[PDB]
Design a binder for these strands. Structure first.
Ligand code: MG
Ligand code: MG
Ligand code: MG
Ligand code: MG
Ligand code: MG
Ligand code: MG
Ligand code: MG
Ligand code: MG
Ligand code: MG
Ligand code: MG
Ligand code: MG
Ligand code: MG
Ligand code: MG
Ligand code: MG
Ligand code: MG
Ligand code: MG
Ligand code: MG
Ligand code: MG
Ligand code: MG
Ligand code: MG
Ligand code: MG
Ligand code: MG
Ligand code: MG
Ligand code: MG
Ligand code: MG
Ligand code: MG
Ligand code: MG
Ligand code: MG
Ligand code: MG
Ligand code: MG
Ligand code: MG
Ligand code: MG
Ligand code: MG
Ligand code: MG
Ligand code: MG
Ligand code: MG
Ligand code: MG
Ligand code: MG
Ligand code: MG
Ligand code: MG
Ligand code: MG
Ligand code: MG
Ligand code: MG
Ligand code: MG
Ligand code: MG
Ligand code: MG
Ligand code: MG
Ligand code: MG
Ligand code: MG
Ligand code: MG
Ligand code: MG
Ligand code: MG
Ligand code: MG
Ligand code: MG
Ligand code: MG
Ligand code: MG
Ligand code: MG
Ligand code: MG
Ligand code: MG
Lengths: 46, 62, 94, 77, 103
RNA sequence: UACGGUGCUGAAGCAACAAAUGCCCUGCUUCCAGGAAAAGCCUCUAAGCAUCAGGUAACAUCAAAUCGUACCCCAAACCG
RNA sequence: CGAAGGUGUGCUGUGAGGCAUGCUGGAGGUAUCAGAAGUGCGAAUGCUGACAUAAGUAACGAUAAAGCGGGUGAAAAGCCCGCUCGCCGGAAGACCAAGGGUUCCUGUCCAACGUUAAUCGGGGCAGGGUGAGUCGACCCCUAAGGCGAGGCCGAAAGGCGUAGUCGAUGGGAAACAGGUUAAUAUUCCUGUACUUGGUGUUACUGCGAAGGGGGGACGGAGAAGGCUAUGUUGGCCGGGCG
RNA sequence: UAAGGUGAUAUGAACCGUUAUAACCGGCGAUUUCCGAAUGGGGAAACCCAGUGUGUUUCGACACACUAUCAUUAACUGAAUCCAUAGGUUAAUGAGGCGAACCGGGGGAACUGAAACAUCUAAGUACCCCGAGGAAAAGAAAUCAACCGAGAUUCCCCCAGUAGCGGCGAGCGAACGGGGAGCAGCCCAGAGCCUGAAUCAGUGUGUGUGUUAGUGGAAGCGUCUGGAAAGGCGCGCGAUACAGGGUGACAGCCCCGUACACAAAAAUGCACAUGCUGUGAGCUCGAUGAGUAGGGCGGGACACGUGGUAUCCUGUCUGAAUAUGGGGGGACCAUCCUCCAAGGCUAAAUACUCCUGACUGACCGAUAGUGAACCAGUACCGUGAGGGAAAGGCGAAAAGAAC
């Protein structure tokens, strides 16, 4: 069957990437939460 | 060498830095092969380049 | 004019290999491990100055680092750059 | 923004209370209107989005005093 | 400000060699010394083709705590604790007994 | 000949027929549902420049950097 | 001269319990009288870990299919070489994009992985391997759309949007054949080409745009005609005479 | 400060050093790639592409600096449109982003409870947004009181679960007054007279006191058991040091320390003193914050749900007097008392702990305690936001088992 994850790095980075998070206010709050929790990989972006 | 190098000109320190960098190249290719059997010379050279760059920023612009 | 200090920091090591020995004895081409940010003109100037030898052409490629496991902890080696430096005919090098 | 430039009036929030005292949040907007005021010294018109209270203030104090207050406040006109 | 140093002659206070003497060969950063000829262990040394070792039961010296040794006072023939004083503006060692400067 | 290979040499190398969903064809015919944009490219002059700049024509010389390039890709290497 | 803890035994109390001691263990334990409680577990389709059971049972993943000799090796139904057999063949062959990211090649190992064994492997370990002016990206250009100086609007955050600037899936310069590596090749080599920019001379002399125009530049279906790829036969050459 | 070193797993190699530029610690410095507010333009973060200028060139080209936006100011320029203005450009200064809690403000729930539920509650709570400081806010009476008087603000204990509010239900819940912590008052709405006089800010200097490396630092032997003594048994000694930790079993006297005594080239905090710059001090005579108070309508805050409801705020419409005046004293009037709104500033007591140092615990002791004693916000899962583990101990010493 066709499963729900059909990967594409361009769409992955445009949707969940660093500059897509840094563009908006709420996306910057996402990066602030992951730094406070201490995530190693802060975003998707390679 | 900070006392020796302090008694030098800017062009003399630049000449020594270029002779150090040539020695650092010849050591790096020598240790690239298995020829170099004195590994401490790479460290001695890297410190002496840092001392020359320090004294150059002291004598010029300071 | 490319500066001599950069020309001294461009070249890292010669690369020993069966392919390097073949290209050295057949095509008169040496294989060098170079700095990663080094370009072809910097390599041609470095070999033409530090070895005083005539370079015909330089081909470059980037070597991707392997992923190794020391014990059970994962790790990754560094990406490094490789240069095929074709010397002109008659030129010789140790 | 529904803000009087002269008085600094602003939409405040309150409640609609029904007969059964059912409270729903509403807003109280100022009666803002854009009006061209003739400045006699500079001999020109200045458009101000001003409430009718502010128009009574301009009719009482004069437009030169108010535009002095708006420059001391740091407000464009 | 170390009391027991390298070329010092010490006596052993505790352990399987309570009373023996020897010279310190090197001091370790962990608060241990290697005293020449005292704390002997027999290591089963494995042969290596490189390094040319045949491999046997090598008897060699193990480290010991600095607390377990004291500097031997060769005058009195005993152990003395070590104090520090300034002579000529220079920090020297001396024996707590007889106030004699360690040399 | 390490039987894996490596070296040397090397004939003929034409014609007919059939023939594509590929090419001419971004064509031609026809229909209505009436079928992207911009740059490169060509050209026109504006201010400006006046015999300098620039233009094309030939020739010489120099440069063309950087990154990817292994391998699977229908699959035991992708999503399951 | 052996603590706690563990494991037995003996004794004792109405009971919760208590005491002594053997073995293990190898360093802490604690009377009494008071004090404070994370103070007592068999159940909560309780939570976590370990071990059973069914049970050495079901199954070992397309009914495309295997047989033999020799080799290696501790050992071969499965590996290698060989001869036969069978299967796909508009694919179960070959080349890529997306995606993965060293799975590529060589040597070595067989613990784990592999639904069996394994000397084998996309497994472990070490080393090696990806070569471009012409391929592609980058780059020039824009679509849908996004962002958006100013601006307009909005309690605030912010929303929309002008000039602009991004944005391919589309437009835009140029390389082919042969050979070669264990592994790369339109990238290396041999041969033969091509394009766009430069500087520099020489001849000639209207050059100039963010502007104007042209071009780029565009649909569906259908009909033939002309070709080629390619194939067949003949000829030709080499070998053969079962 | 030093006789030992070149961080760890993790040896080894090659070396350095031993009386002082070995190492180590601290102060001030130097360098400080790329991304990221990211700021030269773009961008799918750690990448792509420039422009201008000044320099070098072995003409191939190299190196360095600068170039974001907005606000404010100044200069120049500059439309329709004459002047002008908008606009443009240069230049200078500043901001931007991050961050635990506390704080002020703008918005603002519902589950729930009421044994249902709609007024009410939960609760101005959670949450979102904005701004600030080391604290913030508030603050020097148009206040209370009661005919006696008090004398800014904030905080604690009472008053008091009282008075009240309230489908008078559920529930919400003061104040006056009293005891305390802490205390500090001032200025402009304006002229003069005397003129720099108090105070504050900044910047120097000097002294003291800290902080950021450090130094000295007492006093035990014998014997028995035992693998090992710090234990047992004797005999001594120190203590302004018997806090604590380590050392082969439990050490005041083995070690590190502790009590105590000191110590800083350099940086820096805090006090004073004073220098300089700026600042004005005091006296006299005045002035006394208008679309404001108040009112009507609709809401909100006050313990007070419109009620007989004072007081405060304002979205809307209005609208005074002004020291011979006005506000309040819980509907309202009269008398009396008290105060002077429509301009501001102000320390302390108060709140909190991302972080640092010291110490403590009838706090845990590896299914506990942080999710994490261990390379844990990791492995792993998820497109993503996000979720989120398991896993400690040889021995005194590797002497980690030659053969
Ligand atoms: Mg390349
Ligand atoms: Mg409500
Ligand atoms: Mg000891
Ligand atoms: Mg390929
Ligand atoms: Mg295939
Ligand atoms: Mg026992
Ligand atoms: Mg027991
Ligand atoms: Mg027992
Ligand atoms: Mg216990
Ligand atoms: Mg319990
Ligand atoms: Mg039960
Ligand atoms: Mg249970
Ligand atoms: Mg079974
Ligand atoms: Mg059965
Ligand atoms: Mg059966
Ligand atoms: Mg079966
Ligand atoms: Mg099968
Ligand atoms: Mg067989
Ligand atoms: Mg088989
Ligand atoms: Mg076969
Ligand atoms: Mg078949
Ligand atoms: Mg078929
Ligand atoms: Mg691998
Ligand atoms: Mg393979
Ligand atoms: Mg086996
Ligand atoms: Mg197996
Ligand atoms: Mg493998
Ligand atoms: Mg392009
Ligand atoms: Mg573009
Ligand atoms: Mg657009
Ligand atoms: Mg804007
Ligand atoms: Mg927009
Ligand atoms: Mg494309
Ligand atoms: Mg291949
Ligand atoms: Mg055009
Ligand atoms: Mg069409
Ligand atoms: Mg043909
Ligand atoms: Mg026959
Ligand atoms: Mg180290
Ligand atoms: Mg930039
Ligand atoms: Mg940018
Ligand atoms: Mg409710
Ligand atoms: Mg409800
Ligand atoms: Mg209820
Ligand atoms: Mg304040
Ligand atoms: Mg009175
Ligand atoms: Mg000391
Ligand atoms: Mg001491
Ligand atoms: Mg013990
Ligand atoms: Mg007043
Ligand atoms: Mg009012
Ligand atoms: Mg009223
Ligand atoms: Mg109201
Ligand atoms: Mg009114
Ligand atoms: Mg009033
Ligand atoms: Mg009354
Ligand atoms: Mg006031
Ligand atoms: Mg345990
Ligand atoms: Mg835990």
């Amino acid at each position: 069957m066709k499963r729900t994850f059909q990967p594409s790095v361009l769409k992955r980075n445009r949707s969940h990437g660093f500059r897509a998070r840094m563009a908006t206010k709420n996306g910057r709050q996402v990066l602030a939460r992951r730094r406070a929790k201490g995530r190693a990989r802060l975003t998707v972006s390679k | 060498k900070a006392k020796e190098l302090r008694e030098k000109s800017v062009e003399e320190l630049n000449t020594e830095l270029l002779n150090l960098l040539r020695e650092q190249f010849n050591l790096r290719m020598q240790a690239a092969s298995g020829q170099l059997q004195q590994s401490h010379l790479l460290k001695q050279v890297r410190r002496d380049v840092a001392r020359v760059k320090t004294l150059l920023n002291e004598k010029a612009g300071a | 004019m490319i500066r001599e200090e950069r020309l001294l920091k461009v070249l890292r090591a010669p690369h020993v290999s069966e392919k390097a020995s073949t290209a050295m004895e057949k095509s008169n081409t040496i294989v060098l491990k170079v700095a990663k940010d080094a370009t072809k003109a910097e390599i041609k100037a470095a070999v033409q100055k530090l070895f005083e030898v005539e370079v015909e052409v330089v081909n470059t490629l980037v070597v991707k680092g392997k992923v190794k496991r020391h014990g059970q902890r994962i790790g990754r080696r560094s990406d490094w750059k490789k240069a095929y430096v074709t010397l002109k005919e008659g030129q010789n090098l140790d | 923004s529904r803000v009087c430039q002269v008085t600094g009036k602003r939409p405040v929030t309150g409640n609609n209370r029904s007969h059964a005292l059912n409270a729903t949040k509403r807003r109280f907007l100022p009666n803002l209107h854009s009006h061209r005021f003739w400045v006699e010294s500079e001999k020109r018109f200045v458009t101000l989005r001003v409430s009718a209270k502010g128009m009574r203030v301009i009719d009482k104090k004069g437009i030169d005093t108010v535009l002095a207050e708006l420059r001391a406040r740091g407000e464009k006109y | 400000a170390a009391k027991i140093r390298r070329d010092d002659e010490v006596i052993v206070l505790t352990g399987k060699d309570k009373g023996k003497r020897g010279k310190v060969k090197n001091v370790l950063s962990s608060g241990k010394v290697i005293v020449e000829g005292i704390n002997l262990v027999k290591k089963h040394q494995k042969p290596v083709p490189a390094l040319n070792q045949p491999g046997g039961i090598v008897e060699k010296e193990a480290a010991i705590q600095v607390s377990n040794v004291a500097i031997f006072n060769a005058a009195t023939g005993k152990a003395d604790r070590v104090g520090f004083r300034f002579e000529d503006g220079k920090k020297v060692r001396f024996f707590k007994s007889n106030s004699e400067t360690i040399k």
